[PDB]
Amino acid sequence: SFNQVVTALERMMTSQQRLLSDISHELRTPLTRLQLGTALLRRRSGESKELERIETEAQRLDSMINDLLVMSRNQQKNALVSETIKANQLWSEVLDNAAFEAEQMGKSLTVNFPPGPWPLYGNPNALESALENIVRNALRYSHTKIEVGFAVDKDGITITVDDDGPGVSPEDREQIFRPFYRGLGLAIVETAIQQHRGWVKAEDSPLGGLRLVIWLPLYKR
Amino acid sequence: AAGASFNQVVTALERMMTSQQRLLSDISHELRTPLTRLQLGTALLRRRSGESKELERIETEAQRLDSMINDLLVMSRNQQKNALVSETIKANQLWSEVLDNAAFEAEQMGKSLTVNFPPGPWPLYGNPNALESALENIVRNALRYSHTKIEVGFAVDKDGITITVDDDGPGVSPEDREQIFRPFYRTDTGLGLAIVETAIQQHRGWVKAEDSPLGGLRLVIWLPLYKR
């Protein structure tokens, strides 16, 4: 029955993925026809700003569908692949690359309260890229400075990212999380952190901009 | 700790599923952004250059996609809530309520549902919510398209249960029989048989559409029995 349960859980998941790859094939059915259509028009007639725009909007859609497949598969990679990991070990490189990128922009990143050997359970690549996006995003709004701080209590780690940028109005605070924001978006992070039983909140930064608060629970055996 | 390690994995996959629920509804919301840009692009090209077989085709493929995005946005809301648990279950317990609500809905429409061959205490292993909503959609369908009557029949052998749903409605042409199972497919949301086909194939069973002796469409669900 251990095998029976394993085989059952595999089929729950493979069927979810089948349904998704079948929706994407059905969305691509007219999309490929559209792309074949522009291709024939491009050869028959000339190239134009309009035809260029139609062709790039077609790619933009196919890319989104392609992200939907991958990001779905990755959420499975994330639930099945997980381990006990220390706060300082996990995000040290993240903060080091980020410190260098600020130095290049002429800006200054400061880790006032550094992470310690604090137990976390979960996908390391997921949590690595979670803070990485918040930190890349804080390098955008910020005029000159960014500040990262780590806190720990009996319940969990609290990561706080602050910028001296323009920030966000009280109304827009709750509505700062949706994808394809033009890192990628900020809803990837919300999903990623809620996947690890944590939460994310946006606030007024004492620096003048926006304060991003990531909370994750500590790992207890 | 033998089952404590299972709960933890189940809870993880539960959170994994609800995160894939969100991701889908968010992609679908974002898909109308480039589509409108594409439609304003063809519109300007129609104005600049002339009208052509190509431009006509691109414009109709854009509509076809828009429709799908709408269907995807509706079947983003009302997601398949609280699934993922497989268990041993008896056929009669499983679909009793399904057939009872369905018998009442027919009575309201002035139509008549008949369970000629009822389900028995037959062993099944799998997600109950998945199998309940599988037949539920097939009967939802058969209630809508039928003119006056619907017939449900259960059969069992050493290999498995065979559920047959028949309606006196218009039915489907020989060509569209397999096509009605595809996502967004409609003969004229189209995600009904898409979901049923997945739910059955998941339980290593099968679904087929045929000519009904009642005059409409015959839907055949075959599931295997659970052996201890």
Ligand SMILES: Nc1ncnc2c1ncn2[C@@H]1O[C@H](COP(=O)(O)OP(=O)(O)O)[C@@H](O)[C@H]1O
């Ligand atoms: N009982 C039926 N009789 C005739 N046509 C049917 C029947 N059931 C389904 N169809 C056709 O197959 C299509 C696909 O079915 P389905 O996936 O369940 O979509 P929907 O959610 O609109 O019912 C329907 O839109 C309809 O054209």
